[PDB]
Design a protein around this ligand. Structure first.
Ligand code: 5G1
Length: 330
């Protein structure tokens, strides 16, 4: 089997992407944030504290004839940005772009943190990291990909995120018309539960490539590109007036600037992030200070190849017995 679904930016900055997901019988369609950096499929629901719901579409398990309470199971997750959610668990039928999993754990939120409430466009998350990170207790549950894998034509999914435009998540096949040149594959460590890999280096604008190993995660659920302070300093040094602002919480730059591109290495291959992809707009409405899309990972504890990097590529998440990651230009 295969599936194919369009993923759409939630706003004009590409802060996140939502993908429609069918849950239950009859289908209830929710728009979920596909997150290769976590491993829980959770949704706003009829059980979510009413004051914490503000415009989201909810899943109502009592209206699904295929929903079954997973007795005794709870979940609770905290994300790197400080947000969180928790609740109980149903199993139900879940379909993405024509690909159906029966008995998928659907984690129903009883509580969500303010950042989730405040984002009316995201109805939940669909985790696509390794199932070892799943938070369901006392019996850990598998991700949608994990459950689907055996049935897929090939045990893979791909992320093709758009810049200020829709893109695609495919399951079970590689669309050879969706990228240019070849896909370069690189080793993955699953030891931390992530799609963790090592970039071979970077360049800033038309500058020379610096060969250096950068270990990080391919994370569709993180907006920006978080890299070591040395790398980030070298980038922003090429932008007149750019500076790190402790009060804003990262590098900012004059909105009048033209940003240089940023290149990252995948083996001997190179992915070029255009300068425009690194502009996250005014820090506050009407400001002439703009927020940068490349930020330091110092104090996160891990480098994160978030949407800013991933949307510059066609990305293969290869879930073969030894997982790998593939990157192509597009
Ligand atoms: N979607 N990404 C995550 O949940 C994550 C994983 C590891 C470190 C930091 C973060 Cl923000």
């Amino acid at each position: 089997s295969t599936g194919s679904a369009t993923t759409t930016p939630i706003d004009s900055l590409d802060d996140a992407y939502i993908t429609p997901v069918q849950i239950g019988t009859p289908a209830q369609t929710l728009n979920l944030d596909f997150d290769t950096g976590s491993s829980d499929l959770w949704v706003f629901s009829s059980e979510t504290t009413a004051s914490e719901v503000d415009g989201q579409t909810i899943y109502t398990p009592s209206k699904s004839t295929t929903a079954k309470l997973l007795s005794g199971a709870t979940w609770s997750i905290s994300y790197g940005d400080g947000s969180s959610s928790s609740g109980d668990v149903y199993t139900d039928t879940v379909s993405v772009g024509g690909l159906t999993v029966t008995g998928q754990a659907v984690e129903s939120a009883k509580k969500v943190s303010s950042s989730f409430t405040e984002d009316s466009t995201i109805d939940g998350l669909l985790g696509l990291a390794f199932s070892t990170l799943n938070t369901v207790s006392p019996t850990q549950q598998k991700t949608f990909f994990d459950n689907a894998k055996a049935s897929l034509d090939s045990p893979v999914f791909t992320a093709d995120l758009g810049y200020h435009a829709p893109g695609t998540y495919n399951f079970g096949f590689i669309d050879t018309t969706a990228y240019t040149g070849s896909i370069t594959y690189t080793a993955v460590s699953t030891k931390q539960g992530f799609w963790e890999w090592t970039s071979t280096g970077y360049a800033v604008g038309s500058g020379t490539f610096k060969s250096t190993s950068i270990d990080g995660i391919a994370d569709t659920g993180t907006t920006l590109l978080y890299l070591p302070a040395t790398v980030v300093s070298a980038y922003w040094a090429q932008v007149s007036g750019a500076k790190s602002s402790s009060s804003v919480g990262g590098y900012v730059f004059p909105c009048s600037a033209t940003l240089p591109s940023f290149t990252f290495g995948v083996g001997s291959a190179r992915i070029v992030i255009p300068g425009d992809y690194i502009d996250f707009g005014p820090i506050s409405t009407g400001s002439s200070s703009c927020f940068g899309g490349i930020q330091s990972s110092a104090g996160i504890g891990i480098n994160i190849f978030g949407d800013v990097a991933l949307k510059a590529a066609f990305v293969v998440f290869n879930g073969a017995t030894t997982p790998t990651l593939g990157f192509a230009s597009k």
